[PDB]
Amino acid sequence: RYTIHSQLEHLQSKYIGTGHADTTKWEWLVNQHRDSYCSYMGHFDLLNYFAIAENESKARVRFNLMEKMLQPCGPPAD
């Protein structure tokens, strides 16, 4: 039963941010927000943009984005 194709599909499910047919809107959007914040911290001119728009320092913006990564979108249901 051990094929390459079922090994590929199982390794895809291990990559964080990947979903299946029982993924909820909450999970999908939490993934979206988390890698959005990581990408803002990676790209230097997007961070420059936000730091000019809200009149803050870049270290302060990075710290705020880090703090927002623990619970974006609020708490889950149930």
């Binding site: 895809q12 299946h20 979206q32 803002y40």
Partner: protein, 815 residues
């Protein structure tokens, strides 16, 4: 119970003889039950299976992994068994196998970490003055290993005490040997502790025991080699006693002292190097004149190391070292040994590298005419290496005289044939280049004489000489001699020996490559009909050289042959496009390209498409390759309409062949296929909507190769149109078809963008139907793993509900 625990430790048999899954499961089980099992039974079962005489290397590696994992869990519970572990695995530190040593080192490291430093010292202490050299040797090696595992500063006090012991010169010997083994095992990572190690061992150079003095010198040499090039401030209190000792001692001890000197001198600055080299060089000449083989092997290395430092002068070398060196070191007994032979050649090449090639070559050239084959061989090796490193810019007349005389004599009198003389001849003449005009006649006379007879190995050697010398034979403004030897080569074309045939084919190819296709003495019109039946030989060397020769002819001299013969040659070469050897395959691809360029596509493609239908699978692949080669060499503008007329024929097993051809063709031409997507889209639209599954699979392969081949050239309109026809096939239950469709989709991701793919995919991620959701999440997971960061810009806007915030506000900021 004790009788049950072995029955459970059958986990070991599971680990040794089992598949990867069983091995991993049993590894887990034993590493979670190690503490409950205990160090007694675990090792009482592991050690016999480790010292079994029928164990293999992979099972030993697996057992090493098991020992590591159980030592991690049992941390101090092994103290009452350290001695047993060490008795079993103290060998494998001196084994002949390289991996046995590595695994023994890993086991000793993990054991020294599980137990303490104190336990290891208390267990290994008594076997330090044991009167068996073998035991002391392994104890020193194991102490070096535990030092590498626990850090040197932990073992510095024990060594400081054991190297100054007053009761056992055997213990002193063992401690200094431990320092030497530490240096050898750890390398340049000893540099922060150099001063401490040298201070521990420096009192041993003046010991009253000769064995202790010798091991101290060897340890100093090991530390210097490990520290190279840094660290010389830590060797002064040895710099003085070492030079006093080389002026006082004689024998083995002198040999060790000189080895240490030789390692220390390349560490110094210019003045220190010069001074210390003068001293060591005086005693080094006295040892130049010596009987002992080990002594001479040491002395050669010391000369090589001294003469390579910056402070030592080329003039001083020329006036003091070279006369006695060449006087005592270049003789037949030096030629007879092997290790000393290899050391002497290297020392002489490196001496030339600083003194000039002229000095060395002019000193050893006249020995090229000698009655000793091995002496001639050694001289030729040395001269060839020197002229390959430095060149001939400093060689002058009366020296080229002797050089050419000698290499000619050495080539002629060679009885046993080996590539040394061949490569020396080649290097010498190619380093001369333009300057050897006045010698080419007698050179070519010698080559012809060797080629005319002599058992065909002389013939093959002469053929290789021609091969590697033809370039300078023409660039020296000379063509009649190479024309004549090409004629006599062409006469040698029916041979009993394939390796000689390959060599003469190579010589012919080298000649036709440099000489004009005009202006040539053997005519192509008579050469090629002789070449054509050789294409049937099955020796790989013959095949490759013959095909390469025919390719060179078709490339430069196409206007001397008829399209009929070119057609026959094409159809004889066709089946070699899938040969088992990479060299034959690449040679055939090149030759077919040249011939197709020579004649044209019109009538070749006729027969190719003709036999597309009447051939079976193993022969169809070569036809597909040939079609793609023709389209690459003569633009696919001439191939595609004829190939699509073949699809217009109403027959499966023909339309499939056309589709396979198109797939491999786009894959092979690459970015050239960007002008031909619109021409092919209607065929693919028909094929992607078809009842036959193989049609759709092959058409998706075509789309994939097209989209990956054109990337960054702007065919997004055509590929969007095709994506509209690829997408309806994602709801396919057949494995190979769905696998082709997914690959086409991943190629279209690269070609079109993740934005369009995400727009197609957002439809069914939250469909009510679980099947639709399955398929769409597969597609989305592909698009997400490839280009995760580009999706930050393409996600749609999702609104806040009562409880959760889903809007991204930073992106709504305006400046």
């Amino acid at each position: 119970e004790e009788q049950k625990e072995r029955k459970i430790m059958k986990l070991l048999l599971k680990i040794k003889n089992g598949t990867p899954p069983m091995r991993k499961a049993a590894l887990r089980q034993i590493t979670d039950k190690a503490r409950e099992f205990g160090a007694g039974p675990l090792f009482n079962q592991i050690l016999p299976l480790l010292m079994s005489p029928t164990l293999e290397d992979q099972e030993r590696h697996l057992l090493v992994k098991v020992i590591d994992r159980i030592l991690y869990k049992l941390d101090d519970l092994v103290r009452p068994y350290v001695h047993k572990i060490l008795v079993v695995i103290e060998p494998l530190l001196i084994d002949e196998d390289y991996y046995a040593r590595v695994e023994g080192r890993e086991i000793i490291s993990n054991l020294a970490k599980a137990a303490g430093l104190a336990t290891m010292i208390s267990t290994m202490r008594p076997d330090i003055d044991n009167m068996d050299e073998y035991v002391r040797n392994t104890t020193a090696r194991a102490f070096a290993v535990v030092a590498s595992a626990l850090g040197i500063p932990s073992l510095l006090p024990f060594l400081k005490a054991v190297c100054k012991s007053k009761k056992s010169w055997q213990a002193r010997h063992t401690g200094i040997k431990i320092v030497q083994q530490i240096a050898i095992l750890m390398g340049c990572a000893i540099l922060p502790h150099l001063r401490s190690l040298v201070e521990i061992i420096e009192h041993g150079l003046v010991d009253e025991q000769q064995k202790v003095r010798t091991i101290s010198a060897l340890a100093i040499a090991a530390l210097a080699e490990a520290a190279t090039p840094y660290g010389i401030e830590s060797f002064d209190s040895v710099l003085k006693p070492l030079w006093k000792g080389i002026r006082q001692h004689r024998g083995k001890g002198l040999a060790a002292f000189l080895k240490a000197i030789g390692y220390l001198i390349p560490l110094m600055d210019a003045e220190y190097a010069n001074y210390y080299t003068r001293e060591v060089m005086l005693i080094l000449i006295r040892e130049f004149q010596s009987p002992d083989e080990e002594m001479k092997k040491i002395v050669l290395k010391v000369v090589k190391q001294c003469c390579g430092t910056d402070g030592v002068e080329a003039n001083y070398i020329k006036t003091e070292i070279l006369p006695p060196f060449f006087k005592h070191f270049w003789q037949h007994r030096m030629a007879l040994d092997r290790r000393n032979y290899r050391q002497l050649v290297d020392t002489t090449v490196e001496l030339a590298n600083k003194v000039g090639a002229a000095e060395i070559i002019s000193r050893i050239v006249d020995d090229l005419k000698d009655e000793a084959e091995q002496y001639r061989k050694m001289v030729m090796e040395t001269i060839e290496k020197i002229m390959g490193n430095l060149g001939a810019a400093d060689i002058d007349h009366k020296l080229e005289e002797q050089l050419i005389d000698g290499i000619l004599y050495a080539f002629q009198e060679q009885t046993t044939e080996d590539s040394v003389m061949l490569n020396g001849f080649g290097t010498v003449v190619n380093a001369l280049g333009k300057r050897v005009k006045p010698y080419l006649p007698q050179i070519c006379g010698t080559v012809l004489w060797r080629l005319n007879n002599k058992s065909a190995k002389v013939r093959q050697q002469a053929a290789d000489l021609i091969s590697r010398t033809a370039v300078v034979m023409k660039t020296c403004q000379e063509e009649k001699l190479m024309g004549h030897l090409g004629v006599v080569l062409y006469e040698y074309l029916g041979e009993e020996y394939p390796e000689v045939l390959g060599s003469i084919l190579g010589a012919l190819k080298a000649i036709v490559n440099v000489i004009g296709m005009h202006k040539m003495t053997p005519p192509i019109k008579d050469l090629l009909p002789r070449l054509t039946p050789i294409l049937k030989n099955r020796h790989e060397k013959v095949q490759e050289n013959c095909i390469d020769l025919v390719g060179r002819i078709a490339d430069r001299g196409a206007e001397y042959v008829s399209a009929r013969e070119w057609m026959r040659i094409c159809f004889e070469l066709l089946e070699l496009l899938k040969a088992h050897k990479k060299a034959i395959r690449r040679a055939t691809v090149n030759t077919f390209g040249y011939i197709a360029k020579a004649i044209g596509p019109h009538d070749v493609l006729a027969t190719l498409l003709n036999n597309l239908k009447v051939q079976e699978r193993q022969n169809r692949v070569c036809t597909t390759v040939a079609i793609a080669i023709v389209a690459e060499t003569c633009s696919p503008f001439t191939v595609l309409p004829a190939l699509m007329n073949e699809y217009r024929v109403p027959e499966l097993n023909v339309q499939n062949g056309v589709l396979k051809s198109l797939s491999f063709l786009f894959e092979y031409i690459g970015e050239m296929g960007k002008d031909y997507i619109y021409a092919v889209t209607p065929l693919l639209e028909d094929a992607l909507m078809d009842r036959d599954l193989v049609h759709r699979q092959t058409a998706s392969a075509v789309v994939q190769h097209m989209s990956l081949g054109v990337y960054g050239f702007g065919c997004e309109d055509s590929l969007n149109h095709l994506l509209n026809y690829v997408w309806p096939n994602v709801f396919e239950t057949s494995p190979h078809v769905i696998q082709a469709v997914m690959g086409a989709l991943e190629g279209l991701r690269v070609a079109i963008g993740p934005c369009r793919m995400l727009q197609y995919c957002l439809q069914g991620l939250f469909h009510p139907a679980r099947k639709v959701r399955d398929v769409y999440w597969k597609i989305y997971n592909s698009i997400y793993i490839g280009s995760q960061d580009a999706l930050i810009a393409h996600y749609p806007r999702i609104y806040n509900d009562d409880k959760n915030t889903y809007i991204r506000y930073e992106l709504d900021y305006i400046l």
